[PDB]
Amino acid sequence: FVNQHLCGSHLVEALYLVCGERGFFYTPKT
Amino acid sequence: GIVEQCCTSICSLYQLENYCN
Ligand SMILES: [Zn+2]
Fold this sequence. Notes:
A: 1 helix, B: 21 residues, flat, binds zinc ion, hormone, dimeric, insulin
C-alpha cells in the first residue's frame, strides 16, 4: 500500500477502496 | 481522528481499516 500523507478527497477515495462493502465513516472534526 | 493520523502523518493500510464500518 502507498506510504504517504493522504489528505482531503484522496483520504476519502483511499477509504472507499479499502473498506469496500463495509463502508466507512469520515469525521475530520479534530 | 483520521486527519491527524492519516493526513497530518502517515497511515499503514491497517490504520486505515480502523475507519471502516
Ligand atoms: Zn490532489
